From a paper:
The Uppsala APP mutation (Δ690–695 in APP, Δ19–24 in Aβ) is the first known multi-codon deletion causing autosomal dominant AD. Discovered in three individuals from a family in Sweden, this mutation gives rise to a dominantly inherited form of early onset fAD.
The 3D structure of the most abundant first polymorph (PM1), that was solved to a resolution of 3.4 Å, shows two identical intertwined LU-shaped protofilaments related by a pseudo 21-screw symmetry. De novo atomic model building was possible for the ordered core between G9-A42(Δ19–24). Residues G9-K28 form the L-shaped domain, preceding the C-terminal U-shaped domain (K28-A42). However, they all share the same C-terminal U-shape formed by residues K28-A42, which folds around a hydrophobic cluster of residues A30, I32, M35, V40, and A42.
Numbering used by the authors:
A (entry chain I), B (entry chain G), C (entry chain E), D (entry chain H), E (entry chain J), F (entry chain F), ...: 1 to 28
Write the structure that this text describes.
Amino acid sequence: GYEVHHQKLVGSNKGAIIGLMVGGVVIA
Amino acid sequence: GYEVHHQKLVGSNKGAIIGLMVGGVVIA
Amino acid sequence: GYEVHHQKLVGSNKGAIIGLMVGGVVIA
Amino acid sequence: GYEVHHQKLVGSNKGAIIGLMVGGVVIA
Amino acid sequence: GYEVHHQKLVGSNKGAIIGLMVGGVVIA
Amino acid sequence: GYEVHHQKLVGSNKGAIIGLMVGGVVIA
Amino acid sequence: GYEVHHQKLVGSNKGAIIGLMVGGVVIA
Amino acid sequence: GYEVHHQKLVGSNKGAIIGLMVGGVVIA
Amino acid sequence: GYEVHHQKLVGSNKGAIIGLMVGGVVIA
Amino acid sequence: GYEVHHQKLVGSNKGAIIGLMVGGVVIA
């Protein structure tokens, strides 16, 4: 399937992340 | 399938990320 | 299939990213 | 700006919604 | 700015919703 | 600007929705 | 600008939707 | 500008939709 | 299939990216 | 098939990118 020997990963949020939005308002 | 020996990954958000939007408003 | 020896990856958002939009408004 | 008199809104998820993904795996 | 007189809103999840994912696995 | 008298809206996910992806794998 | 008297809207996903992709793999 | 009396809209995805792609692979 | 020895990848958004849009409005 | 020894890739958005559009409006 999926195989990796050696790795380094980074994820970062500094803003807005939304899954499901109804009717709202998002700024920046 | 999918194979890798050595890697480095970065992901970053500094703005707005939305999955599913109904009727709302997004600024920047 | 898919094979790599050595790599570096970057992904960045500084604006608006939307999956599915109904009826709404996006500015920048 | 933005103006509405009368409305009805629905949003629904039955699958996978992701904002920011690094290195992972998504099935269906 | 933003104005509405009369409204009805619904949001529902029956699956997977994630903000920020590093290295994990999501099924359905 | 933006103006509406009367409306009905629906948004639905039954699959995969991703904002920002680095290096990962998506099936269906 | 933008004006509507009466309307009905539907949006649906049954597959894969991606905003920004780096290096990854999408099947269906 | 943009004006409508009466309308019905549908949008549907059954496959792969990508915004911005770097280096990756898409099947179907 | 797909094979690479050595590589560097960058992806960046500074504007609007949308997957599926119904009826909405996008500015910049 | 597809083979590379050494490479550098960049992708950038500074405007509007849309996958599938029904009935909406895009400015810039």
